[PDB]
Design a protein around this nucleic acid. Sequence first.
RNA 1: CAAGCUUGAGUCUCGUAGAGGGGGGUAGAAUUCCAGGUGUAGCGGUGAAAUGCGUAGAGAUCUGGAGGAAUACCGGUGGCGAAGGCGGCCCCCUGGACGAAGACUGACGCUCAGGUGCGAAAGCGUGGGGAGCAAACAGGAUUAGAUACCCUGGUAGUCCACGCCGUAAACGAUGUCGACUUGGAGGUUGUGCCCUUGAGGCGUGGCUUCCGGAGCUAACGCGUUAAGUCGACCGCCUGGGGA
Lengths: 66, 104, 129, 88, 85, 173, 70
Amino acid sequence: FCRFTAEGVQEIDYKDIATLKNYITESGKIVPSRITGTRAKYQRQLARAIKRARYLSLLPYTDRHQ
Amino acid sequence: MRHYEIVFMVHPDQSEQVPGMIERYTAAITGAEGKIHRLEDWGRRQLAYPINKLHKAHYVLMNVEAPQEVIDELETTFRFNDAVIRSMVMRTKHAVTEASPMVK
Amino acid sequence: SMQDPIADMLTRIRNGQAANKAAVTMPSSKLKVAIANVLKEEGFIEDFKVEGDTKPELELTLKYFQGKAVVESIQRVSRPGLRIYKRKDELPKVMAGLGIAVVSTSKGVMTDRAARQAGLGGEIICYVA
Amino acid sequence: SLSTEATAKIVSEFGRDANDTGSTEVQVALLTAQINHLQGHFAEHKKDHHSRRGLLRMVSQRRKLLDYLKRKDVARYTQLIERLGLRR
Amino acid sequence: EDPWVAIAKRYPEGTKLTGRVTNLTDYGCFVEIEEGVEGLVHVSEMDWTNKNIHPSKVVNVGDVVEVMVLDIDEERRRISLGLKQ
Amino acid sequence: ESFAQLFEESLKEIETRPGSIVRGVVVAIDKDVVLVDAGLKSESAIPAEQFKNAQGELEIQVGDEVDVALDAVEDGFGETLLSREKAKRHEAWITLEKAYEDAETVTGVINGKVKGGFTVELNGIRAFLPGSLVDVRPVRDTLHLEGKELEFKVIKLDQKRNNVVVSRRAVIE
Amino acid sequence: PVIKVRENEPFDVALRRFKRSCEKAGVLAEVRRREFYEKPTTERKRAKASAVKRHAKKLARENARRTRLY
RNA sequence: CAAGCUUGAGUCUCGUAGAGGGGGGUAGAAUUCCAGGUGUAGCGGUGAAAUGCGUAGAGAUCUGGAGGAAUACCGGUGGCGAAGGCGGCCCCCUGGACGAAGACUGACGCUCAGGUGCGAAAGCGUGGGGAGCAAACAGGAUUAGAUACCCUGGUAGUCCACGCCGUAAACGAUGUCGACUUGGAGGUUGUGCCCUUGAGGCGUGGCUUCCGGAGCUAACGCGUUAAGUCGACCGCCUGGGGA
C-alpha cells in the first residue's frame, strides 16, 4: 500500500519535510518498508531525501541530540 | 549546461546582509551566460539541531543552469565566507521552475 | 556459439520425442531439410514443412506409436570437432540393420543402405534408431 | 561516455550516408575517440582499474574491427589508419 | 500516505472503535477497520486473565468488537489497541 | 463447438466477482454449517452466524438465495468470502440513497458513545458514529427513554474508514 | 525515547509507556548487538540463516497444516 | 576463392535502476584523551575473584577543545561488479548492465596453451597517521600444569600515499559460449496496452530466491540459473601415504 505509486511522484523531495516526517521515527530513525509498505524503489529515494534533510538540519538525526 | 540546485544557510545575525549576497551570487551566474530558474528566500528558520551552537538560521534556495566552473567558484566562496554556515549544491536533471512545498 | 546446426536439430528432435511434443520447429538449412526428408522416407517422422522467405523455419512433425516415441535413439556421428568419413565397405549398420545411418555422399544425402546399393560411401551424419 | 554531439560529428565524417552509424570504419573512429578521451582520465586516475577494464575492452574491440577490415578490404583499412593515425 | 499523515482522529487516549477482527496469530487478534490500518489487541488484555487465554477461544473469527486505540505510533504504523476496557 | 466458447463468455456475462448476484441456493443445512452454490468451482463452508437475524435463530431453508463475496480463490479447497459482508454493500446503498433527496430515513436508536458519537444500529448491524451525529442540537439521548425510537439523520461519515454518526429524535429538523 | 508525564497521569502507567517506547526503539537490542564485534562473515551467516529459518516456518509448516493432526 | 543475406556479433537514438570504480569535500552519533566545573568513595571486572584505576578526588555528572576510525535507522536470501569486492551525504572524472522502438554494419563470431592484466586477509618496503580494536608481550585468574580459553593492560598491525606480495573453504567446493526440454510461489528492475472507474487488469523483456516434474545421479541431491538433452573450445584427475 505505497503512497508514492498512487500519487505517482517522479522523485521524493527532501524539502517536503512534512511528508518525510510520516516516514521517520519518534526517535528520528527512518521507518522500515515492511511497516510503511512503501515500494522498494521509492523507499531508497525516501531514505536519501531524509538523509539530505538531516544534513540541512531540516530533520533531526535523533531525538536526544542538541 | 548542468542544472544545479543550491541551498545555503546563513548565520541569523547576518540576515540583513543576505539579499546582497544573493544578488552577488546571481550576478556571477549571469556572467557565464547561466540562467537562474527559481530563487526562494526561505528566511529565518528553526534548526532541527544546533549547528555551530546556534538554533536558528537563514535558508536560501536557488536553482541555476550554469557551467561547472562557476558552481565550483560559488562553492569556494561559500566555504571561505563565514556568514554562510552550510551549503548544499546538488545536481538536478531538469530546470524545476515550480515553487517548493514549504513556500507553498 | 552455435557451431553444429545438424546436431542441434537432432537434439531438438530428441527433446520433442522425450516431452511428447507434436511438432518441432527450427531455423531451416538445406542439409537439415535433406536430413528431414530422409527421416520421413525412412518413416521416423510424419512430415516436415519449411516456411518463410527471409529466414525460413523448418517444422518437423514427430511420430508416436502406441504412446512411446518412434525415434528411440538419434546420435550425430560426424561433428565439427571430429569428422567421420566412411568408404562403402566400411559403412555401418545401425541396430543390426533395423535403424538407419544418414550418410552424405557425392550423390546427395541418403540412408546407409541406399549408399551401399549405389556403391559409394561418405560423411556419416547421424545414426537414427 | 562520449557526448552525443561529438558522436554524431564522428558518424557524419567517417560514415558515407551519415545516417549509417554502424559502418565498421565509423565504429572504429568512435572507439578511437573514446580511447583518446579516456587516456586523459587514466593519466590522472591510475588506480581506477574497473574503468580501465572497459577501456581495454574497447581497445580490443577496435583491434578486432581493424582486423576484420583488413581481410575484407585493404585500401579502406589503410585510409582509416591514416585518418586516425593508428600505428596498426 | 493516506491513513498515516493525519492519524490524530481516533487518537487522543482511549477512543473506542467498532472493528472486525481478521486473523488471530496465537499472540494476537488483528482487529483493523479504520480505512487501511492495523491494530493488534495482542493477548495481554483481551479478557481479565493474562496468559492461559489463547485468543481463538475467547473472542471469535471475523467479528466486530469493542476496541479502542490505547496507543498510536504514526511512524512505525503500530496502533496498539486493547479489549480489556 | 463455439457453442462452448460463446457459453463461456455468456457465463462470464452472467456472473460478477463481488457478493452482488444473489445466486447461491442453500443446498444443505446442518448446524453449524450452511452451504450454497453460486456457480463457483466449489461450495462455501458458510457459518451459521452470517445467517441468523437479530435474535439468534435461522431464517433461510433450502433453496434460498443470498450472494456471498469473491476475489479470493482457493486456500487449498473451497470457495468464498462470506455473504454477510454482501449485506454491507446493501447498507451502503441505503446510506448513499440519502444523497438523492438529502435525507435517508429508517429508524436510528442511539443510547451511548463508545468513542464520542452515539452508536446507531440499523436492522441487524450496529454502527458507531462521531459524538455530534447522535443529536441535532445539545439535546442528549441520556434523558430520553433508553434505546429510543427515532431514525438516524446523518451528521458525519468518514467515507474511507467506515464510521457513521446519525441524528436521533428531532423529526422537524 | 524522550517522554513527559501528562497532567494527572499515574506513575506506573508512565513507566509502562516509557518501557513500550524503549521496546519500539529497540535500544536494548541495539546495545546487546554492539557489545562485541561480530565478524562480517558471522553477521552475513546469521542473516541468511535466519532468513532460511523464516522461509521454512512460512511454507513447510503451511504445507503441514493442510493435513489434519488426528 | 568470388559475390550475397540478417536470425549471431556489434554501432547509433531516448530513457532506466544501481554500496560499480577513481578523486575531492562535508555531516552527525559514539569511543578515547586534554582543560575546567559539580561531587564523594568507590569504580571496574568475573562463574567467582584478583591484577588494574581511585581521597594526589576515580567512577558518575555537566561545559569546552583535540584527534582518528567507522558510517546506526534505511537494509531486504535487496542492488551493482569478471572475480576479489563495494554501504552516511554532496560534487567532479569514469566503466558496465537493462529496456523501448526504429536505423545501420553484414559473420566482424565462440573458445584459448603460452602471454598480459586485475586479485580478500595477513605480510613486506619508504613516508605519514594512530581514536577504537589487538597478534606479540606483561600481570591476575582457572588448572595437576594452562607457554590457552576468562580478566586488566598492551606493541606491531588495522587507517592514508606510492610500490611489492599473488595466495584463501579466492566455494555454487559446479570452466566459458550457444541451442533445446513440463510447472508453481516470490523478489527486483524496465516496458506495451487497458475505463489506472483504485492500492489494480492483461501481457512482454532483464537479473534474481525458494519448491518441485521428466530426466539425470552412488546416493545425497540437481532440476529452464541442470548436476537434464546436445555441440564448440579449453583446464584438470588416474589408489592411500611419502608430498
